Amino acid sequence: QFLQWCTLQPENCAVFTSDNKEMFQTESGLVVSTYSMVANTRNRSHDSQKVMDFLTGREWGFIILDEVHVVPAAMFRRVVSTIAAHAKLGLTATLVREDDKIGDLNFLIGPKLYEANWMELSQKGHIANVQCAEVWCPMTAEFYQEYLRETARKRMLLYIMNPTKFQACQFLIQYHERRGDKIIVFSDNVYALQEYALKMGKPFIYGSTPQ
DNA sequence: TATGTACAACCGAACGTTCCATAGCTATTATATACACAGCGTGCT
Length: 211
Description:
By secondary structure, this protein is mainly alpha-helical. It is 38% helix and 8% strand. The strands form two sheets. Strands 1-2 form a two-stranded parallel sheet. Strands 3-4 form a two-stranded parallel ribbon. Strand 3, helix 4 (77-82) and strand 4 (88-91) form a beta-alpha-beta unit. The longest helix is centred in the C-terminal third of the chain and has 16 residues, at 163-178. The two termini are 18 Å apart. The chain binds one DNA strand through residues 18, 34, 36-37, 40, 43-45, 48, 153, 188-190, 206-208.
């Protein structure tokens, strides 16, 4: 995106991820990295230790914290202190977290400059309109009976795999595919994700996947 | 505090056979000459 929208020459851009760790040697350049590769404290590899020293030694002029709703976490906030910078910007669509650490952003990166409405940009053609829906798949009699006895932690897997949900997902997928739509099926539970994918013969992605 | 989930690190060529082109040898006739050799025929024993 940086290359496409502005005239940033590729020579001055270095991506510090788990794959490649080379750093730009030109006087002034750009580093696009991740919190996991910059907030680590205990164990850094030899290849990743020179890069971190390269980041720390120089006095940067600007830091862009994408998805800044995770910076006030227990350890991610450490990067805001270690990295030297005279300007800090936070970019996030959602500025909410379950705990009370959201307010910590004030003394980490500063105040909230601007906010934008969602419907205003939707009616102006800048973002798409969505008809949100919530389908009620009544649990079948057989599955439901077990839901009463089982404990909290297993009850989750029980009400995620009820057959009616399989039928509803299969019907919607077929209906929208006929409409020439590209569908995404989210699932935080990996076992259900694999079971659904192998049952419908569709690709799936989860945490164990190589980049 | 515990459990999920996520992330980072440790195959050639020699020889043989046939085909043009030029020049030279072979055979025949006559004659004188004379030598050596290979025959045939007649008398002797």
